[PDB]
């Protein structure tokens, strides 16, 4: 006997509204922000890195910290080119805000750097930004580390002035984790505590191909149901590489459910099952109108 009465979205919703389900961890990737216009920065099939010759570069050096600290100009020129015209979180982001409102959100682990989780109303304590964030920036000198807000960094990016610390004139870097940098200590300390406590893993908009983030699904207790909302099935064991892997379809499947489609539409469907459609619609329309009215 398993926790889901059937391996479907309808089964998951019944489980969430049972007393057995109290603490939900969300694992989210670039798929939850493409609807807001944010490209997948890890995908070479998004045309982001087609115009890098102008930067007279050696490709991956654009995001390697060693290269950045010596030649920061290419990164900041790219950042200007790609800076979003607007920061409007998606239906998926506000669904997690509703999970928070209803006392169900234990933690959201995000691969994204775009700050939309914070704009949607998740708080720092709710979030593990596994790859950092553009939300804040810091001087890179170890004896300084002066912090700067996005408004300050934005103004440097758009005026094409390489950002420098006002106290010490070292370079100032967005708090994203470049290649070559340590991953955040908070990612590991939170994982060791949260996965002792999780009742449901909600995995949305990630293909689960980037480590160590993808290994989080194997940290769940064996009984914990795992729902994937994503355009493509993901997280199954690799027939070549072979283990915590997802099992949606075998005769041994017992807890993993795949809902295949756009993340906004899957979150809409789950909310409707939960009785939350009107609440979710009202929240999105209100926050979107507010952002659109920013003067």
């Amino acid at each position: 006997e398993r926790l889901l009465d059937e391996l479907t979205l309808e089964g998951v919703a019944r489980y969430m509204q049972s007393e057995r389900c109290r603490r939900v961890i969300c694992l989210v990737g670039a798929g939850i922000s493409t609807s807001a216009g944010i490209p997948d920065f890890r995908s070479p099939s998004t045309g982001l890195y087609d115009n890098l010759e102008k930067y007279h570069l050696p490709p991956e050096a654009i995001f390697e910290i060693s290269y950045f600290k010596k030649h920061p100009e290419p990164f900041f020129a790219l950042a200007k080119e790609l800076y979003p015209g607007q920061f409007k979180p998606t239906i998926c982001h506000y669904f997690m805000r509703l999970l928070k409102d209803k006392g169900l959100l234990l933690r959201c682990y995000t691969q994204n750097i775009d700050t939309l989780e914070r704009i949607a109303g998740l708080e720092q304590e709710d979030l593990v930004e596994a790859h950092g964030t553009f939300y804040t920036s810091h001087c890179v000198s170890a004896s300084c580390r002066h912090e700067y807000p996005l408004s300050w960094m934005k103004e440097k990016i758009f005026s094409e002035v390489t950002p420098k610390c006002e106290d010490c004139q070292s370079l100032v870097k967005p708090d994203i984790v470049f290649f070559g940098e340590s991953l955040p200590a908070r990612f590991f300390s939170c994982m060791q505590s949260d996965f002792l406590k999780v009742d449901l893993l909600l995995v949305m908009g990630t293909s689960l191909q980037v480590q160590p983030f993808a290994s989080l699904i194997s940290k769940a207790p064996l009984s914990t149901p795992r729902l994937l909302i994503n355009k493509e099935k993901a997280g199954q064991s690799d027939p070549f590489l072979g283990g915590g892997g997802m099992d949606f379809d075998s005769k041994k499947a017992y807890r993993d459910v795949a809902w295949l489609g756009e993340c906004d539409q899957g979150c809409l469907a789950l909310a409707e099952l939960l009785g939350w459609k009107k609440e979710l619609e009202d929240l999105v329309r209100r926050e979107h109108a507010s952002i659109d009215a920013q003067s």
Partner: peptide, 7 residues
Amino acid sequence: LPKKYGG
């Protein structure tokens, strides 16, 4: 602490 690598 582990460093960030491709993939």
